[PDB]
Each structure stands twice: as structure tokens, then as C-alpha cells.
Design a protein that fits this description.
Chain lengths: 359, 359, 360, 359
């Protein structure tokens, strides 16, 4: 029964998937005398939290009742009493948090606030699942870095283009559509100029209710990206480019007026850990790296990736000097190559979709 | 009920695999009055035919009986009467064929020879299953060339070794063990000398009962193979080298004394179509092409393969100088790269086997 | 199938009211504004807020121009607070997805009618079968004015309840006993004959974890020969309604009533099943779990008054004529007049096999 | 791979099912130098044995070869040489048995006869699969009593008729048709005169594929069976009657003249135990007891059934005077009713088919 009520809280929480933007999905269940009297979930960014809806729905049955919450109740004494306090004043006797605040700084303030009020607080009930709920979000608060997803579509022999650099549709139609989805679940999309220049890619999640365009990030060491690129122009979604001192001053103040946020790095070459640091500062909590063989390589030798997604089409491109899946410096020795782990294998159309994760 | 007996025949047929060599696997069942009176499969090479075994067993019950054969009964007059004529004499009144002879000048010949004696003949029953069974052989007999299977193991990102050639631990032990099956269903294992230089493998079948062993085929352009390589000294299996006129006649000597057979081609380079044709006139019908990013490339560029099987491990070898699955030429435009079709997506241990075929 | 997803969700939310509601049906609602799930609700406590109400509130302004999926046709009647249908009209909602209509044919379609007048597109159907299973009993009691009748028994593989002597110590496994106990939780009453009382002195209560308002213990007497001794009488754990005839003894009747036992006397010398179910139906009993009496089960099958059969067969053979079979009594003489049922479930609880079936 | 061969030998044996009738199911597979060259199965009663077939099919490959049998090689020295010999004469190195001949007397002779000829004898391989293959034969040979299967059809409330004896629509045509199958997997059908005097059956499996009608056995204490009954006049099959000294002499003759075997038991009442003993002494190894709630009673009361089948219908008959499934005495105390065990619960049409076995 304990875990039951918590499972429900989870299921409610999930209903708000893709509706909170940069807020954590959350659910809550108010049980009273062995009867569910209140249920709730964070449904829309900036609107009522999950503990609120539930409490309200439970009304007078809140007092002397329990309340299962997926994540630790809000505890800032901001512009309104916090959900941690709102739980207090409602007369709830026992609270069942699943997992604590992601922010090392706040973690516990909620549990404390309540516990010192006489509320019995139990933690960890199904916290194993109350973890999967918001991977990307929890990663960000725990590591201050965005959640990186590396994606690519390649031939069966790991070539993302032919000798000519021609990528005239390696993967099928169904593949694109699928891959598109990720452009909606990530705060940003990232590519290296080597792609940009040779594709003028839009990089705009063209899915259902977009209600928020992802930041388009380009990596350019000497800032050579042409001004006739849909990312430079078409002011659809934001466009940030990272570069070194090597960029032209005028071109920089130019495109900077066009809305393009140019970030300059004081290093010889652009260092991935540095751009993921910047981004986490500009509030981005996730990046969808899908650009260039070289960019995918720097991301690998660095270890800056949480997820790997490759689309493999029934076709052999071949060619020794044809761009391969991952480039970069690589790993000279096999004993130094880290061990990933296949997460999921699913066939999209005639193509195959392999997905893996670290350790 | 027709497919029950035709399926019994298919399972009997298979009880002789790898005991016929360049001959077809055939199963035969004689049903009398709703009762199985005789079973048979082609067991040894150059020995009794499945129809022979089954009809003898069937004895006098052969008369007024039926018989389900997985392949048009032998209809030529050699040392012994053909099986079709053998059917005709036993008094069988009905024959069920799964498929006609792969040879054009023989197909349907036995069928009519039988009809001709008042025998009612049906066909197609479990045609596909009957196809799959002698798949390689069928190809060989229809195309005149060996059935070619390409096989390689690479990290998830298609690399088959690092920038330094280090390829230790790319395929799990569970894998090698699986891939070892093809060393039992193919009449030859081929690799370039490069593979002999890099890993000096025995290329032998090391599965449980391993009666016979496949012919180890190495493509060594200028006979630079190392005279001390296992493939040249273990005597565990045959070894055939394919070289050009640039080889050393005195080395071919030293090597022939070892039991290896050295084919000397006339072209400057080595054409896969060339060796493939010789392997066939030699009775070799199936070829399992293992190592050789370049070798695989030739077989592919020449379109000389029937099945691709790649093992992918949850690892990422970076590498701007790393060897990918297929090297060499390579198609210049996507509008030319041939479309394959995944036939199976099996997960082996923490690894993953992808197998696909052309067209 | 995005519609069905939202309706499936609604259904799921409704199941959560499985406990508190008593008579009131389980209902789930979900409001969606521009592909987003703005509000969720369900009927959680008898006499309190209806499903639609909760979800519509939690939706706020989003309600305006949204769609709402309800597992049952919305309120249409006017009494204390505004009817859920009127609430939907007023909230903005441009379209409703109703799974099934109201059971009481006196109301059936009244809500749908109303919302339609207000220009709300009403799409009926989505997952009706499911919405039907959610209140299988409630609906029956509503569409037929009679309780839901579940008959349960446990016999030997050859259909016996005891041996030639009456022994029956180990006829059905403990796993079976327990599995059969869950129904005591899903019914509003348990029916049993007098024989079973005077022969087992049963508690006919629910021991399964988490119980609220014990079911009504209903005993079919005749000449009121039930022992004042104990259990259904002294055991003051749950209500006990005894049905008697004229033969009953006056003194004894008001003696049992001196406790809290309710007594119903009929004007016939043979407790007729249909009469009992009707009295129960009137008294507000939407469901009966008749496990008692070999004969008790007989009346219920002859009169044809049962919507579910649950027979537990142990892997034992008792045999012997004169051994008490499953259903004693009148039965059916000619075969032509034997009703055909339908096996709805074949499970295996421990050593025994639990067979269940329902009418044509 | 020693279990492969035995498992294979098992399948081949199953191909003889319901053809060997009185004989058991054996499967002989001869292997040499790592490859099958022999396969056989007992296909027809009074004909070649599983070994005989695999030998001759192995010929000279039998010299210094193995051979797997499912049942201890025959030793009945007579008309031809005991298979024990063919195994030695053919020059067989090793021999494998899955189990020993269940026949008390010859439950060693075969294993030995070759064992002393010097051949290594490994036995017990896949003995459970080889046990299930001849569940009925095994029983008979071990206990000296036939395999007894009881069958009955009834309403869900355990009735076999209405209070007025009506029983027109109990089990659907599916269950009745399923019921038939047994009629051919048994050597005889047991039923009491009541059944004859009641339904005057033909007691023959109508299903077209029978070249050996089962023995019709009637238990009739005082010989009151109708003289013009199908079971006597239609002489489509053998008809055995078990009666007592109360049987009217003249009538015994009248019936026996019709070619009906009358066994007059020496007791006053028919004892299933005696009847069974007598039946085995005549060849019958199996018996399928249908009719007789009275007869079933006996068989149960004596504990003379290795298996029982009950077909239930989705109907409630009811009736304090309606005939129960098992009639007669029955067990007086629950601490005395044997415990069976459910073996299969497969539905047939609207009916359900319950099957359980002893201890
Ligand atoms: N099928 C698929 O999944 C995809 C295929 N492609 C195709 O594959 C190929 C991939 O492009 P590729 O040329 O390898 O290059 P990339 O798109 O990875 O761009 C590489 C360039 O970006 C800059 N860059 C990359 N990594 C870093 C780093 N770590 N730090 C600083 N700067 C960095 C450098 O710019 P500079 O040196 O100029 O300063 C470098 O030359 C193309 O032919 C493209 O068309 C592209 C995307 C997806
Ligand atoms: Zn909060
Ligand atoms: Zn032939
Ligand atoms: Zn309502
Ligand atoms: Zn034998």
C-alpha cells in the first residue's frame, strides 16, 4: 500500500510531460483513513504545483492525512507560502517524499521545515522511479551541466556521408520524423560549422505544439560561418555561436545585432566542457548534439555525453576517407575506451535505432 | 496435414547438414494409409539419397503410398537409377514437391518424368522453408558462384580497431562464440594476409563437435604472409593462398611443402570475381569472409556478397585515423549506394548482431 | 488513438475511487487544452464532488476551449449544486467525449442533450466496454432494479460439497478460501441459508486488508430456527438481516431485535428468492454474494437470479450417490429448459481450479 | 551434444505414434565420426525395430560407431536375431539407452547381452522425455495392469443428466469430438451394460484413419445386455463381456455364437481389480472407461485409474435426484479421499476439459 500510493503519484506526475518546459514533473497523493481524497500533478509551467492541486482537491480531508510526493516539497518562503508550508497548515500528519531536492543547496530544507513542525517524513519510497521521471532535469541540478544527447544517422558501416561528403538521405523518412522528436525534448540543438556551411540546416523542431523553440548552437573556431544560413537568418529560434579570439571584430558586432549570441572562448580551440559550462549558465538544461563527425568525436573523447542515439540504415557506403560516425582524437588504446551499455533497440521503418548510455 | 509431413521432411533433411558438403540437404517421408512408413534424409556426400533411404524403409508399404520430398527427386541416369524413377517403380501414387531443381536444365524434369507414370504431383508445399534450408547451395547452383557472407566486429561507432590497430576486447566472448557457428556452415574462411599479419588467427572451427574444418583462404598479393603463421603451421585445417606473379617461386615451394595450396592469378591485382570463380570450380560453394576492412570493401564494391553480419559492442572508439568497418573505394553518391534489408536484429550478451541482405 | 489515451487515463483515475462511494458510481474526467492535459479528477467520496467538478476546477481558465473526456454521461439534474453538464457548458469546453450514457433510463441522454444545445460537440463511445466493466454491478442494479447476484461454491472434482456422511473438512485449499474472500469485499451483502449458520456458525465478514463498512450479512431462515447462540447475532461486527415467514415465533423475533438484528417477515410459507432480492434491492443493496446453502444456490439458479457463477474445484474425487452435490432442489426436468451460460474465466488457485461463467 | 542425439532420437520415435499400437515408441539414431548416418523409429506393429532401421541405414558406418536408443535394445530371441545382436554384429563401439525395458523379467537382458559382448553401455540419457513417450506402455509393463483413463461429461454443477434422465445437450459436439481421439489411443473401451441398455452405442472411433478398431468391453453382472444391440450384431469390432455365474447359460451361447467373447468371472459381483488383471493377461495394455457413473465409482473406489478426464459444460442442470458424476458408495471420510493433481486445463468450444492424475 505504501508504494502503491506513491506509484500513483508518479503516474499523475507523468501526465505533465512536455508541458513544464524547465520545471520538474511532479505528482502528489493525499490519503485519508485509507481513502484517496486528493490527487495532483504539475501540469503547466509556472502554474500550480502538484502538492497544491492535491491539497485543494482533498479539502477538509487533508488534516490528519498522509500525502505522497514524488519530489521534495517546495520550501522557499517566496511570494506565497511554500508547498512544504502549505502541507503543514493543512493538517497533514505524515508525508512520504520519494527523493530530495536536486539542488545540493536546497536539498533538505523542505524535509526539515516539515519535520520540525511535527510532520513525520519518510523518504525514498520508489525514489528509484521518482528518478527516471526527470533524468535530464536532475542531471542539470546535480552537475550544473546540461544533459547531452549525441545523435546521428549512418550507414551500416558507420559512415555519416560518402567520399564526396554527400549525405543525400542515408536514413529513411521515418527516421527523420523520429529524430525530430528529440529536438522538442531538449533545450538546445548543437552542430559544428563543418555541417552548417555544407547544409544550411534549419535546426527547428517542426513537431506538434512547439510552444517554445530550442536554442541553436554552432561551434566555430575562427567564426567563418556564412551569413546566408537559416540559423543566422529566419529569426525562428535563437542562435548562439561559440568562437575564439580568431573571429573578425566587425562580423562579430554585426551578427550580434541580428540577434545571434556570440560567445568568445579565450582558448586555442573550442573546448567542449567550456561550452557546456556556459550553456548551463544561460539556463539551458539539455543539449541535442547531432552535428558533424568531428563534433561528435570531441564529445566522446571528453566524456561529455549522457546519451547515445544512432540510426542505422540498411546500406553500406564504404570509402576509407568518407566521414565516419565519431571522429575526433578517439582512444588509442582499447583498455582506455569506456564501456557503454545498450539501452534500447527499436526498428523505425527499414532502419534501426540503437540507443546507449554510460557505465 | 500436407504441411505436417512436409515439415517432418524438412527437419529430417537438416539432420545431415555439414555431411554432404557441396550437395543438397533433402528430407523424405512416405505416408501410407495416413501412417508414416518411411523417413529419409541425404546424410553422407556421394551416398544414398533421402528418397532412397525413405523408400527402402517404406518397403512394400511404398505401393499406393505418398511421399513428401523437399526437392524435386533426382531425375538423371547415372550409376544408379534416379530417385524419380525409383519413386515410379515402388508404386507410389502421390508425390508432394517443395520446389523444383535449381538447375535450369533439370527443373521440372523429374516432375514430369513422374507425372508421366500416372503419378499425381503437387508442388510449392513449404517452398520457402525448403528454400532457406539449402539457401547457400541454391545460390551456388543458380548463380554459379559461392554464397558469400561478410562478417566483422566493430565498436558501436563502426570502428574495428583504434588508430593504433589495437582491437583487443571489441567483441564479447559470447559473440566470438556465436560467430563461430558460421565457421561450421561455410566451406571456407577468407581474409587478407593483413589479418594474418595483425592477429595470426587459426580461423578454425572450435565449436563443440567439429568433425570437418573449413578451407582457410588468405588473399596474399605478393606472398608476404609469415611462414610461421598458425594458418601455415598448425595443420588443423586446409590453407589456400591466392597470390599474383609477384610471389616468390621458391617460397611457394617452401609453403607447398607445408600443405598449403597456392593459386597464382594472372591479373596485376586480385579480383574478387576471379578467386570466387576458382573457389567454385573447386567445389567451394559458401564463403565466410571475415577480416579485411579493405577485403570487405572489394567484395562490396564488386557486389560479390549475399549476407552482411556485423557485431556491435557498447563502446565508442574515437578516431580520425581509426579503421572503420569497410575501407577502400566506396560509393560517391547516395543515389548509387545499394539498398540492403535487415533480416535479423539479435542481441548477444552486451553486444548486438545486425544481419542484412541485398536488394 | 490519442483520444483513447485520454479516455483510458480518465478510466484509470476513476478506479481510484474504488473504496469510498458506496452506491455512487466510479467516474473519471480529464480536460485537455491544446494538446495539454490541464485538469484531472474522479469521484472520490460518497456525497462529495463529482469527477467532472474536480478536473474542471484544476483546469482553471484552460477549460475555455478545451475538451473533456468523461467515463460516464455528466449530471443533468438540478438539486443542490449546479449539474456537472451545466458546469461543462459554462466552463468553455467546446467538446465532450462520453464513454457511455447514464444507466437510469429516466436520465439516459439528458446530459448529452443539454450540452449539445449549448453547441458542445458530444462524441459518444470511446472505450465503452471498459467504462462498462468499471461499474458492472452498479449498472446492473440501475438498469434492472435488482442487485448483482454472485453465486460461489467449492466442490470436489466430481462436484460434491461433502461425503455421504456430511464430512467436508478439506474440500477446498486455503489459497482458494482466501481468493474467494475478496468478493466479500466487492459486494454489499453476503447471502447464506439457515443450514450454513447452524452448521458452521460463520462470521461471513471480510478479513482482507483494508475494509470499510462491513458487508451486510443476510440469512435466509424459514421457521426462524437460527441459534440465538451467536455470530451473525451476538457477533456485533456487521448488520444481519434475517428473512422469515409466519411460522416464526413472536417472542424470539423481538428478542433478536433487542440486539440490532433486522427481521423481514414475508406473507408466504416458502421464502421465494425474487421476493428477497426485491426487498434487498429496495433496502439499497446493489449486490449479493450467495455462497451459502446447497439448496440456497438451487433456488437462485432455478429462479434464474444470478449474474455470476464461481465454482472452485479441488483435485479430489469424493463420489458416491447420496453425497451432497453442488445444487440441490427442483432443478430442471427437461434439458430444453436448461439455460446456457458462458465461461468468463478459468484460473488456477493453488492445487484447485477456479471456474467462472455468466448467463448467455 | 550427447543430448542432441537422444532428443533427436526422441522426435523420430514420436513419428510412430498410434501405429505401433501394442508396441512401444523407440527411436534409434546411429552416429559415426561426428555425423549422423543412421536414424530410425518403430513405425509398424509386428515389424522392424527402431535400431534395425538406423543400422541398415548406417551399413558399414555402423562398424566402430555409436547408436542411441530411447528404449533398451530388443532381446526377444526368435524369428530373427535380437536387436541386441544386430548392435554387436554390426560392430557397434558404444550404445546409449535412455531407460531400461520396463518388463520385470527382460529389464536387463538387452543392456547386458551387448554389455558382455564388450560394448560400453551408457544409460539414463533423457529418461524423463523417454518416460513420457510411453506413459501407458511403461505402466502396463511395470504394474502388469492396463493404463486406465476415466472419462465423463457433465454440467458445471457436476451432473450427467436431468432428474428425468434427459441428457441431450450436455457437452457440445466439440467435446464429444475431442473425446473420440482417446478411442484410438487406447486398446479397449470399457463401459457397463447400463450404457448399452441406455444409448446402444457403436463404441468405435468413427474418425477416418483407423485400421484396428479398439476392443469393446462391457461389464455386465447378470448378462442383461440386449442381444440385438450394435455392440454385438454390427460386428464392426471385438466385443468382450465380463459376467458372473448369474449369467443365463443359454444366452451366453446365443451371444458367443455372434463371435462375442464372454469372460465369466468367478466372483459373485464384478471386481474391477479382477477384470483388469484378466484383461492384461490377454494383451490389452490400455483401457478407456467411458460409460458408468456406477462403473466410474468402482474404478475410483478401488483406485484403478492412472488418469481421469472431465468435460464440463457452461450449464447448470440441478436436481436432488439428478445423476452425479461418480455414483455408488463413495468415500465416507475426507481423510480418505485420494489427492489427485491437475495436468491440463484446455477449453473445447464452450466446454472446459479438466484432467487430473493420481498421487
Ligand atoms: N547523418 C548524420 O547524422 C549527419 C551527417 N553530417 C555530415 O557528415 C559530415 C560531418 O561534418 P564534419 O566536416 O566532420 O564536421 P563538423 O560538423 O563536426 O564540424 C567540424 C568543424 O567544427 C569545428 N569544431 C568541431 N569540433 C570542435 C571542437 N571540439 N572544438 C572547436 N571547434 C570544433 C571546427 O571548425 P574550424 O576548424 O573551421 O574552426 C571543425 O572544422 C558532413 O559531410 C555532413 O554533411 C552532418 C550532421 C549529421
Ligand atoms: Zn511546490
Ligand atoms: Zn535423388
Ligand atoms: Zn457529475
Ligand atoms: Zn529392438
Amino acid at each position: 500500500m505504501e508504494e502503491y500510493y506513491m506509484k500513483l503519484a508518479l503516474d499523475l506526475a507523468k501526465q505533465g510531460e512536455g508541458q513544464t518546459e524547465s520545471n520538474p514533473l511532479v505528482g502528489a497523493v493525499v490519503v485519508k483513513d485509507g481513502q484517496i481524497v486528493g490527487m495532483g500533478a504539475h501540469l503547466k509551467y509556472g502554474e500550480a504545483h502538484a502538492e497544491v492541486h492535491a491539497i485543494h482537491m482533498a479539502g477538509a480531508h487533508a488534516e490528519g492525512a498522509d500525502i505522497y510526493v514524488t519530489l521534495e516539497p517546495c520550501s522557499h518562503y517566496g511570494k506565497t507560502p511554500p508547498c512544504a508550508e502549505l502541507i503543514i497548515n493543512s493538517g497533514i500528519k505524515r508525508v512520504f517524499v520519494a527523493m530530495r531536492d536536486p539542488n545540493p543547496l536546497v536539498a533538505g530544507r523542505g524535509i526539515s521545515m516539515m519535520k520540525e513542525a511535527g510532520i513525520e517524513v519518510r523518504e525514498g519510497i520508489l525514489a528509484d522511479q521518482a528518478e527516471r521521471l526527470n533524468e535530464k532535469f536532475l542531471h542539470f541540478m546535480r552537475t550544473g551541466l546540461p544533459y547531452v544527447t549525441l545523435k546521428a544517422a549512418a550507414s551500416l558501416d558507420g559512415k555519416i556521408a560518402t567520399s564526396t561528403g554527400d549525405s543525400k538521405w542515408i536514413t529513411s523518412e521515418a527516421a527523420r520524423q523520429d529524430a525530430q522528436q528529440y529536438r522538442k525534448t531538449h533545450q538546445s540543438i548543437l552542430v559544428g560549422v563543418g555541417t552548417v556551411k555544407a547544409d544550411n540546416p534549419s535546426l527547428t523542431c517542426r513537431l506538434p505544439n512547439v510552444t517554445k523553440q530550442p536554442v541553436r548552437v554552432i561551434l566555430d573556431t575562427v567564426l567563418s560561418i556564412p551569413e546566408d544560413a537559416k540559423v543566422i537568418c529566419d529569426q525562428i529560434a535563437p542562435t548562439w555561436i561559440f568562437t575564439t579570439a580568431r573571429a573578425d571584430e566587425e562580423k562579430k558586432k554585426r551578427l550580434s545585432a541580428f540577434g545571434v549570441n556570440i560567445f568568445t572562448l579565450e582558448t586555442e580551440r573550442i573546448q567542449i566542457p567550456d561550452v557546456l559550462k556556459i550553456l548551463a549558465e544561460e539556463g539551458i538544461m539539455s543539449v541535442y548534439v547531432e552535428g558533424g563527425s568531428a563534433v561528435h568525436g570531441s564529445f566522446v573523447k571528453e566524456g561529455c555525453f549522457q546519451e547515445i542515439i544512432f540510426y542505422f540504415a540498411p546500406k553500406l557506403i564504404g570509402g576509407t576517407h568518407a566521414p565516419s560516425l565519431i571522429s575526433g582524437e578517439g582512444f588509442q588504446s582499447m583498455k582506455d575506451v569506456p564501456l557503454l551499455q545498450f539501452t534500447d533497440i527499436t526498428q523505425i521503418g527499414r532502419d534501426i535505432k540503437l540507443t546507449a548510455k554510460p557505465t
